[PDB]
Amino acid sequence: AEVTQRELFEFVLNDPLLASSLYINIALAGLSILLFVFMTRGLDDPRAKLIAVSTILVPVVSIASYTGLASGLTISVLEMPAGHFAEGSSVMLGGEEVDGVVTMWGRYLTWALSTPMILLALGLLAGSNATKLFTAITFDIAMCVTGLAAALTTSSHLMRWFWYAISCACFIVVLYILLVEWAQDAKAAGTADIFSTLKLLTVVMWLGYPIVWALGVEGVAVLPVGYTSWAYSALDIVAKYIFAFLLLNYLTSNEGVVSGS
Amino acid sequence: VTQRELFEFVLNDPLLASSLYINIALAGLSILLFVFMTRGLDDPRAKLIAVSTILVPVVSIASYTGLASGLTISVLEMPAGHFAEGSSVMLGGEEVDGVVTMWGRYLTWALSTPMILLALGLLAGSNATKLFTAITFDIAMCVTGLAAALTTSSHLMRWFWYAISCACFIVVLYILLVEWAQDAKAAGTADIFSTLKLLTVVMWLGYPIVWALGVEGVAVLPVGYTSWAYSALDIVAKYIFAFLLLNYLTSNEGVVSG
Amino acid sequence: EVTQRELFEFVLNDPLLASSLYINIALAGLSILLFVFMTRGLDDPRAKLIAVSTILVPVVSIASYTGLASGLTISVLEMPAGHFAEGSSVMLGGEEVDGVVTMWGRYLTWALSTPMILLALGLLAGSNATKLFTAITFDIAMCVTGLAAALTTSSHLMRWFWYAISCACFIVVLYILLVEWAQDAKAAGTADIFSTLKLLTVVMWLGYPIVWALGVEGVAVLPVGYTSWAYSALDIVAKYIFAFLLLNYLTSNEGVVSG
Numbered sequence A: 001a002e003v004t005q006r007e008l009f010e011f012v013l014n015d016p017l018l019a020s021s022l023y024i025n026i027a028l029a030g031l032s033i034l035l036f037v038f039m040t041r042g043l044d045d046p047r048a049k050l051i052a053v054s055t056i057l058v059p060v061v062s063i064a065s066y067t068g069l070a071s072g073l074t075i076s077v078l079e080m081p082a083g084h085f086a087e088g089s090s091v092m093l094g095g096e097e098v099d100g101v102v103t104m105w106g107r108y109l110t111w112a113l114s115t116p117m118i119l120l121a122l123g124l125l126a127g128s129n130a131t132k133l134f135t136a137i138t139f140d141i142a143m144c145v146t147g148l149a150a151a152l153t154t155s156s157h158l159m160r161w162f163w164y165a166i167s168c169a170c171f172i173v174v175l176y177i178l179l180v181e182w183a184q185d186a187k188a189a190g191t192a193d194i195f196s197t198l199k200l201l202t203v204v205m206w207l208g209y210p211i212v213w214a215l216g217v218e219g220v221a222v223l224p225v226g227y228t229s230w231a232y233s234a235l236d237i238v239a240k241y242i243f244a245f246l247l248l249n250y251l252t253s254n255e256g257v258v259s260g261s
Numbered sequence B: 001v002t003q004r005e006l007f008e009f010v011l012n013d014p015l016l017a018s019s020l021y022i023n024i025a026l027a028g029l030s031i032l033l034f035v036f037m038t039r040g041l042d043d044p045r046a047k048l049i050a051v052s053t054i055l056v057p058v059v060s061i062a063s064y065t066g067l068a069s070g071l072t073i074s075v076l077e078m079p080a081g082h083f084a085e086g087s088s089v090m091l092g093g094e095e096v097d098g099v100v101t102m103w104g105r106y107l108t109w110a111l112s113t114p115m116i117l118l119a120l121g122l123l124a125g126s127n128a129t130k131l132f133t134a135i136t137f138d139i140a141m142c143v144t145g146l147a148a149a150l151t152t153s154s155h156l157m158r159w160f161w162y163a164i165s166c167a168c169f170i171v172v173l174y175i176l177l178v179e180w181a182q183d184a185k186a187a188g189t190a191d192i193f194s195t196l197k198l199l200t201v202v203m204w205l206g207y208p209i210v211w212a213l214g215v216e217g218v219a220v221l222p223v224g225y226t227s228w229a230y231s232a233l234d235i236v237a238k239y240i241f242a243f244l245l246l247n248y249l250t251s252n253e254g255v256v257s258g
Numbered sequence C: 001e002v003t004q005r006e007l008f009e010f011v012l013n014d015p016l017l018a019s020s021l022y023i024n025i026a027l028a029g030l031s032i033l034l035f036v037f038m039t040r041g042l043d044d045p046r047a048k049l050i051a052v053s054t055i056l057v058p059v060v061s062i063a064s065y066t067g068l069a070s071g072l073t074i075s076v077l078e079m080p081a082g083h084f085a086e087g088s089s090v091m092l093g094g095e096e097v098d099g100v101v102t103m104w105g106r107y108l109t110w111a112l113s114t115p116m117i118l119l120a121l122g123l124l125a126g127s128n129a130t131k132l133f134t135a136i137t138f139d140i141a142m143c144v145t146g147l148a149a150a151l152t153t154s155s156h157l158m159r160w161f162w163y164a165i166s167c168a169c170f171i172v173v174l175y176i177l178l179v180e181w182a183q184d185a186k187a188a189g190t191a192d193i194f195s196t197l198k199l200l201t202v203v204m205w206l207g208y209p210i211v212w213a214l215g216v217e218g219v220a221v222l223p224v225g226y227t228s229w230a231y232s233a234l235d236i237v238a239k240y241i242f243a244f245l246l247l248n249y250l251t252s253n254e255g256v257v258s259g
């Protein structure tokens, strides 16, 4: 590994766009954790608290994920394959010019850890049975891991996009459960309004990621590294922080509705 | 060596490329077929079994792609005394010491078997305790096997990892063939387990036997034959076996429901 | 480009390192035997589930310690400026090498074994699913963020930030085990054994973050050799004896936990 972790860390700092897209989220994730733990202090029902802890875990994983990226621990320099729209790039790391693209794979590694929690909270709010919850979660993880594999794949351009297509198929499974299955389960659960709201927000925001992947450096490359990074951090601010705040706003005011068992 | 160089090593070699790309394609077709076959299930418990099984070829088309792209393939120099020691291969167009190691296979098993196990356990009316015990040791088995494959410091260490792993294997096989076959009687599903009993014992024992005999073990099977031995097993386990389980599940939805 | 073969030889020919690692392999091995023996009497599925979660602990340990012993889970890393271990060197093969022999494999031991002992202590206390889900997730986040700290070499300050995140997660777990579960056990019938262990718990669970901060990963008052025995000493207490005291109570009180 020619490029050191210190060097990548230094490249992030010194790069205004990059460093801000990263450090701003370590900050917002921390404040989110503090606000969430405070908002839910009055919950007592175990099923209501399971929804609150899973929610809270989202920014908890987020602050760790971004610290991994900012430290350089979860960043690597890869060389795109022939034909990849970003093939032939250089990053100027340390003092020399290194071939390749600064790859922030750390985003994928942790999405596989935070998104299931989001899914678990939304399934429970909707009063979902174990089967649909297992189906939503297992495919979500697969969607995130194949995403991480595509980003990590440098041997073949066509391979990169094959991983991507596998990931989309797994994505549609989750989407179908959100829009079709849980939408209906929410009625019987008495949480229709809030679910339909959070459901529409989820579908809209989540669609943003595979769009950014395809337009950013890892895909067709119209967005340079610094910009795809901000595209991902901005989706994160809504998809994770504001979204979790909204779900917890309902829960903390309607404990009785989801209290069941 | 480079990822692309490994990717090209697999393409360009009929034995290797076939042992991998064929698994990618059959896994793809099996996901469709499995989703199709089960389009009619209605019971939640049955459906859990069907999705857990469907995940088998999903994990397979993904993990094999990891291998074919070279992402999960690596080159390792075997320890002194190992029967494959002093091997070399030619990758970046040059003599590279070591053996191409498809460590991605352990990922495939560590992720798909927990799913087939969950499916079988539920089918057998297993309680939580035996389901847990089986899945945990099944995973410890798959991972210690991986450890064995990646160990290059000592020849004896690899075999010690193997012993650790085989131990976890009998724990899993025991509940699979013995415990669950017995629980299935009360669940009204004893027959699917006896019909697939020989198929199950042969394919499962098939993996630790291929290890010992292939490049990772005593090496009477070269890298390419080692790849095809594991691949022919996977084809049986991830596709035909899963199909059989699914074929039964669909005909017995009501009873598996309760 | 140090090899796994050189790391394996480094541990051997290094008395302290070799014994801290090899004594644990041996002790975890017997444990699996002794624990299998002590619990062959069990019949209750709930008592047995608790029994196997606990047996999985020494299994995880003998396997993870073998990873370390084999060199598989060891690496040489260079510490960042200001770090007390920065500027370290180690003899590997036929040349001097910058860095610190990093036993990152230990974090995989804790990440995989602790959720089991937590799933054994929770069920033993009668814990509902919410607490059991909390304690373990934050426990896992703790183990993984600790590794991140150990794996971070770009910034001295970042290591301690990672260590602070890990420590906060650590607080959630200790609050569940010491307080919540302590209460739940009263309605479980198993409040007395939960007490004593809870006491040994505090001391040993705290022992880890204290060692981290004082060993080569922290301010390094303890060299690589001593941090390893420090952790190995703690694992003996938690993975074997603690597991023994737990099983000793279980197998002599299957009626109380039965259900």
Ligand SMILES: CCCCCCCCCO[C@@H]1O[C@H](CO)[C@@H](O)[C@H](O)[C@H]1O
Binding pocket: A035, A038, A039, A042, A248, A249, A250, A252, A253
């Ligand atoms: C810029 C300053 C930051 C201000 C943040 C204010 C958010 C506080 C929201 O309060 C919480 O609302 C819940 C109902 O939804 C109540 O149950 C709970 O008791 C109450 O504490």
Ligand SMILES: CCCCCCCCCO[C@@H]1O[C@H](CO)[C@@H](O)[C@H](O)[C@H]1O
Binding pocket: A156, A158, A159, A162, B007, B008, B011, B024
């Ligand atoms: C079912 C999904 C599997 C996808 C398999 C993709 C195989 C594509 C092989 O492409 C070729 O690779 C060579 C490298 O060896 C290049 O030199 C050559 O220019 C390129 O055209």
Ligand SMILES: *C/C=C(C)/C=C/C=C(C)/C=C/C1=C(C)CCCC1(C)C
Binding pocket: A108, A111, A114, A115, A143, A144, A146, A147, A148, A163, A164, A167, A168, A171, A206, A207, A209, A210, A213, A236, A239, A240
């Ligand atoms: C906190 C993060 C969130 C909610 C992330 C969501 C991410 C996705 C929905 C990602 C999806 C992708 C695909 C469907 C295709 C391949 C690439 C990915 C991983 C970007």
Ligand SMILES: *C\C=C(C)/C=C/C=C(C)/C=C/C1=C(C)CCCC1(C)C
Binding pocket: B109, B112, B113, B141, B142, B144, B145, B146, B148, B161, B162, B165, B166, B169, B203, B204, B205, B207, B208, B211, B234, B237, B238
């Ligand atoms: C994909 C389907 C199945 C049934 C896979 C089974 C895998 C095993 C039984 C693997 C076993 C191993 C053992 C027992 C010993 C060390 C090496 C292996 C991991 C190959």
Ligand SMILES: *C\C=C(C)/C=C/C=C(C)/C=C/C1=C(C)CCCC1(C)C
Binding pocket: C107, C109, C110, C113, C114, C142, C143, C145, C146, C147, C149, C162, C163, C166, C167, C170, C204, C205, C206, C208, C209, C212, C235, C238, C239
């Ligand atoms: C193997 C058994 C036990 C009980 C292990 C416990 C481990 C911890 C409590 C580890 C804690 C850490 C913290 C809080 C901070 C970062 C570094 C550590 C991972 C060592």
Ligand SMILES: [Br-]
Binding pocket: A044, A045, A046, A049, C128, C130, C131
């Ligand atoms: Br609770």
Ligand SMILES: [Br-]
Binding pocket: A061, A062, A065, A107, A110, A111, A114
């Ligand atoms: Br994340």
Ligand SMILES: [Br-]
Binding pocket: A129, A131, A132, B043, B044, B047
């Ligand atoms: Br269902």
Ligand SMILES: [Br-]
Binding pocket: B056, B112, B113, B116, B237, B238
């Ligand atoms: Br399988």
Ligand SMILES: [Br-]
Binding pocket: B127, B129, B130, C044, C045, C048
């Ligand atoms: Br049992």
Ligand SMILES: [Br-]
Binding pocket: C057, C113, C114, C117, C238, C239
């Ligand atoms: Br433990």
